Design a protein around this ligand. Structure first.
Ligand SMILES: [Ca+2]
Ligand SMILES: [Ca+2]
Ligand SMILES: [Ca+2]
Lengths: 1081, 116
């Protein structure tokens, strides 16, 4: 049909009991009913075996015909079931060398399977059908394969392979193979001897020689040039010697003696495969009967096999795999002698069929690892992001997931790599399991996806990866390194293990392209990114860095602030200048070779060790314009692009990175593309144009969350007039005077600076009288501890409506600090409520000037009572209130309210029923507005008053002695008003910590109150909860705040909105939002 | 002050290290105790056997040099059994130093740590 497309809508693992088991050797294993009952299988009759085993999945996806959990055929005796398991070593036929060769599973040390009742019943094994009717030959022996292989050393560069025993010190190493009963005394001894060698000196009489039981098999000459010895990357010549040697008297043990003639060289044995000619006779041990040597028949032609000494508790399975195991129907031909007819080799002339003869009385249990929870990855909806995590790292992964789900609004799926292996490789670790899991969604998406649209999903490998995936090499032997779980690494091995590069791009190759297309030339369908973190501490740091990046809105305005002109100019080859504004340069990080050959191999074991994780050196350049284009490096983006291999151009010119002329072009959604997609399209574009520049074929790592967007504004806020003057291009030019009403006007534009009439919502803006500057407190001591005058005074802070791209507001300059030289600062942040889009701007055109001391006796205008309420904002004079009302009043005088104390009746006072008995000095309850010049606020809890009508007068005086009165009435009704509270922030602006003092109307009573903080986009930063009690005695409550967000990250500088809510039983009463400015973050 | 003896855990080591060596030439021979006074102002019928329950489980970095043990976050009651040995007297004064740390998650409330 061109591809496979039977991805199940629901996994088998979604229900029933599941128990993971494993093997370390191919053979028949057995599970008794007692063992099954003992592992939770209430009814053992319903249990079946599932999975693939060891032996890797094909990288040619078309060859994978199965999906979800494949049922394994099983033989069932009385109170036990049997199945043929497959270990990590598996063998294939090489028609050139007319022999069989082995293959070690790079990802696993074992073949994992599953036991489950979910089935309803086991898949009963069937009779073998391929057994031909007529045999073209009667066979007297089969080929017994054996394999000596020590996975000791792992040179990162060489390949996917590990190497064994060294001949550096020991010039002769002996390997003994046990020869088993049915081995023939005399016959041809087939041997594949694989080793690697790098000479320490040039030329010389160097030779690797093998002799079995004293008979010399071969003597291989080895040599190297002065330039080959002098090279660092050469790192050894791999050699594989095939050969059949007629041998005599091979009976109990086969002693192989490998000798390298020279001491001091870097020479290691990889493995020895040994193939003996054995009789078809049961020798008290199961036998994998295979026949390829001296074949007297053609591919697909049948042969009569006759085994003697069989115990008849023995069966013969034709088992090339676990999923294809079939019971060979035999016939008895004599005492303990059975016969069957079958093809030793397939009709394809590339397959050697395996006939496993085994005495089922001797079969024993596999390794029962235990029960596994139900799962259903197959039934998941197509997410935006897939986070594949290790166990330890899971809550830190889920934290990032929750952040992405909440802030970025997107479907994110978190899974454990174990889970992926369970549903995509029958529980066995395999790099292809990741790829298949992704492919499941890709295929699903493609079905209904419109023509032209690219696959939107992304994958985040939340974990570090080891080059030696099995952690079997000597360097890995160490409990931390051992007991840590890593994600798999995929190593793109080229033709005949010449070179190899480790890559995560493999996981994003989900198309149904043909097998002729190598891993290098296939289409990168899905963006993949990795956080090479080992421990949760590492992980939290990564996630915190990624979260804080998106939230620090002020870091993104620094790249937009570059309008004053490591700025390197790029020499390349109105509408032309517009394309260069959207351009960007990514520079590759080149992970070096820090160690003298052997060090690197013993100490640089994982991706993290190689590509040093801590996002390092200038990675992303933005090309800016006011030939040679000027480009600047901006904002510490969590992402890092890393390679080890170096890449050159025409005539060895080293490639430092790439430039995307359309990097910062916004998508249909009006947002920039995610780094993941930017890189994906980039990567995809390098193979798409590898016809003109064939020499290069670079692969690099996206180390970071692929869902990260460059913190760079989509829209900018631009002031157009300040007190009538045009501020664009001006620095400390527009003069503002103390107590002067300043009128502001501005617009909202796109990133290119074009006016955006579609932008309509609110704009938040804070005005400082100067700039933050380091100040050293001097003295006649050489040491001078220093601060930041982190109090450029806030002149004004407020919100304004933005209609059809524009806005206008005004404010009064406070009578405050103007000794500051140079410019002031206006921060602006706009939010378009409908598109949820954010705009930002910074202006330095204002400069404050000295307020001359004239018209000082002019303030004859008394303070203005802006508002004066009890409990709620909806209070008219004479309304029904409770015996302890919460008195709130906003007040205003241009020259300030007198809090001084004493000096006749100059105090702020509340005199209930014109009696000294009930006259309250409210100087201690007044809090001057840090945000609105001349404004102040009184907040007091009126002590208990008796039921009935009452009257009260608020009197407030200013510094210039002018007074004002405000009379109002209220009826006290016992238990009528709702519960409500208000809060004041001390200090404001906020530097390091914030304190919230809450006042309420129900004293001496418990109440659920909470202080809520919001950002200019309206999103809740956090909700600090508090409980009052009988122990307060009508005293306000205080809350200290460390400025940490709901995601456990410190908030950045900016305009926030604080308020408090009282969670009563019958409803929830909130207070008025109040401006909060943060400055020392 | 508390007219009792208190313990102290070596923060840097789990063991007491020593050395064996012939370098000496001969061992330092232990001497007889001299401080044993000629006349006794009292004949005593018992001594103070000290025991110590201490689990070094949690290490709040801020708090101190000390590690803390068993939590009462989930389990509200934790029992500790000390073996009492032969020469322990059936009846007598039971001296106890009980050290714990506590941060409330809500204000006020009837919270009490009780030993029995
Ligand atoms: Ca190997
Ligand atoms: Ca006045
Ligand atoms: Ca302790």
């Amino acid at each position: 049909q061109r591809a496979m497309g039977k991805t199940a809508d629901r996994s088998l693992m979604a229900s029933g009991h599941w128990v993971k088991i494993r093997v370390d050797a191919s053979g028949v294993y057995r599970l008794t009913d007692e063992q099954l009952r003992a592992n939770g299988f209430s009814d053992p009759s319903k249990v079946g075996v599932f999975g693939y085993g060891g032996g890797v999945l094909p990288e040619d996806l078309s060859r994978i015909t199965t999906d979800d959990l494949p049922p394994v055929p099983v033989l069932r005796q009385g109170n036990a079931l049997y199945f043929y398991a497959v270990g990590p070593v598996t063998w294939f036929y090489n028609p050139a060398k007319t022999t069989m060769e082995h293959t070690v599973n790079t990802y696993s040390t074992h073949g994992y399977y599953f036991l489950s009742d979910a089935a309803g019943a086991p898949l009963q094994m069937s009779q073998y059908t391929g057994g031909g009717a007529s045999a073209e030959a009667l066979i007297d022996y089969y080929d017994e394969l054996m394999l000596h292989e020590q996975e000791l050393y792992s040179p990162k560069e060489s390949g996917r392979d590990l190497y064994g025993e060294s001949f550096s010190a020991v010039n002769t190493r002996t390997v003994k193979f046990p020869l088993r009963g049915n081995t023939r005394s005399s016959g041809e001894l087939g041997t594949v001897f694989s080793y690697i060698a790098k000479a320490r000196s040039a030329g010389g009489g160097r030779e690797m020689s093998l002799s079995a039981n004293g008979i010399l098999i071969f003597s291989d000459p080895f040599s190297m040039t002065s330039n080959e010895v002098s090279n660092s990357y050469l790192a050894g010549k791999k050699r594989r010697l095939y050969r059949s040697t007629p041998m005599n008297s091979l009976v109990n043990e086969l002693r192989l003696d490998a000798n390298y003639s020279m001491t001091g060289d870097a020479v290691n044995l990889d493995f020895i495969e040994v193939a003996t000619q054995n009789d078809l006779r049961y020798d008290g041990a199961p036998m994998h009967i295979r026949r390829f040597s001296n074949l007297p028949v053609l591919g697909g032609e049948s042969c009569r096999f006759v085994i003697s000494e069989v115990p008849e508790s023995l069966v013969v399975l034709q088992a090339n795999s676990s999923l294809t195991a079939s019971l060979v129907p035999v016939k008895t031909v004599g005492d303990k002698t059975i016969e069957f007819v079958a093809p030793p080799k397939g009709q394809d002339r590339r397959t050697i069929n395996t006939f496993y003869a085994v005495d089922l009385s001797q079969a024993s249990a596999p390794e029962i690892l235990g029960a596994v929870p139900n799962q259903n990855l197959h039934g998941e909806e197509i997410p935006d992001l897939i986070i594949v995590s290790t166990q330890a790292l899971l809550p830190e992964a889920d934290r990032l997931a929750t952040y992405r789900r909440e802030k970025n609004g997107l479907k994110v799926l978190v899974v454990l790599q174990e889970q992926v292996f369970n549903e995509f490789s029958g529980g066995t670790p395999d790099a292809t399991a990741y790829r298949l899991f992704a492919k499941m969604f890709y295929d699903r998406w493609k079905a209904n996806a419109p023509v032209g649209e690219t696959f939107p999903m992304q994958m985040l490998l939340f974990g570090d990866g080891a080059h030696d995936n099995r952690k079997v090499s000597v360097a890995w032997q160490k409990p931390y390194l051992q007991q840590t779980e890593f994600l798999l690494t995929f190593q793109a091995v080229n033709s005949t293990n010449v070179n190899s590069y480790v890559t995560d791009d493999y996981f994003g190759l989900l198309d149904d392209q043909p097998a002729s297309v190598n891993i290098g030339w296939r289409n990168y369908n899905m963006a993949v990114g990795r956080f090479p973190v080992r421990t949760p501490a590492e992980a939290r740091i990564a996630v915190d860095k990624t979260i804080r990046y998106e939230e620090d809105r002020e870091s993104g305005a620094w790249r937009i602030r570059a309008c004053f002109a490591m700025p390197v100019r790029a020499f390349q080859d109105k509408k032309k200048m517009l394309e260069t504004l959207q351009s960007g340069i990514i520079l590759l990080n080149y992970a070096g070779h820090g160690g003298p050959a052997g060090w690197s191999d013993e100490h640089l074991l994982t991706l993290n060790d190689i590509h040093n994780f801590n996002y390092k050196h200038m990675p992303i350049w933005i090309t800016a314009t006011c030939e040679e284009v000027f480009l600047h490096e901006k904002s510490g983006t969590p992402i890092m692009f890393s390679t080890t291999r170096v890449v050159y151009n025409t005539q060895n010119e080293k490639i430092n990175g790439f430039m995307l002329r359309r990097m910062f072009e916004k998508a249909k959604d009006g947002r920039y593309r995610t780094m993941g997609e930017i890189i994906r399209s980039a990567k995809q574009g390098m193979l798409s144009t590898v016809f003109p520049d064939s020499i290069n074929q670079l692969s690099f790592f996206l180390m970071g969350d692929p869902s990260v967007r460059m913190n760079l504004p989509t829209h900018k806020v631009q002031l157009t007039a300040i007190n009538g003057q045009d501020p664009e291009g001006q620095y400390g030019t527009i003069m503002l005077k103390s107590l002067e009403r300043v009128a502001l006007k501005g617009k909202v534009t796109d990133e290119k600076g074009t006016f955006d009439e579609t932008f309509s919502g609110k704009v938040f803006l804070t005005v400082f009288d100067g700039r933050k500057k380091m100040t050293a407190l001097e003295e006649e001591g050489n040491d001078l501890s220093l601060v930041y005058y982190d109090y450029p005074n806030v002149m004004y802070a407020g919100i304004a409506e933005v209609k059809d791209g524009l806005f206008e507001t005004s404010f009064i300059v406070p009578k405050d600090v103007n000794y500051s030289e140079h410019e002031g600062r206006i921060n602006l942040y706009a939010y378009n409520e409908s598109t949820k889009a954010e705009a930002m701007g910074v202006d330095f055109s204002i400069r404050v000037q000295p307020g001359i001391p004239d018209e000082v006796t002019e303030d004859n205008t008394p303070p203005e009572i802006i508002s004066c309420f009890l409990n709620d904002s909806t209070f008219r004079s004479g309304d029904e209130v409770n015996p302890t009302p919460l008195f709130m009043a906003e007040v205003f005088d241009l020259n300030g309210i007198n809090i001084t104390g004493s000096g006749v009746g100059h105090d702020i006072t509340l005199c209930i029923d014109g009696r000294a008995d009930l006259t309250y000095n409210l100087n201690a309850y007044f809090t001057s507005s840090a945000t609105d010049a001349g404004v102040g606020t009184i907040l007091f809890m009126i002590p208990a008053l008796a039921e009935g009508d009452h009257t009260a007068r608020l009197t407030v005086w200013d510094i210039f002695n002018n007074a004002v009165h405000h009379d109002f009435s209220f009826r006290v009704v016992d238990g009528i008003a709702p519960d409500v509270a208000d809060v004041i922030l001390f200090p404001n602006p906020v530097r390091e910590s914030a304190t919230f003092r809450i006042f309420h109307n129900r004293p001496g009573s418990d109440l659920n109150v909470v202080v809520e903080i919001y950002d200019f986009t309206g999103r809740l930063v956090n909700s600090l909860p508090v409980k009052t009690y009988s122990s307060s005695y009508g005293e306000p409550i205080e809350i200290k705040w460390d400025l940490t967000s709901k995601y456990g990250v410190k908030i950045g500088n900016g305009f926030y909105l604080y308020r408090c809510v009282v969670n009563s039983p019958g409803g929830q009463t909130a207070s008025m939002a109040k401006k909060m400015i943060v400055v020392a973050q």
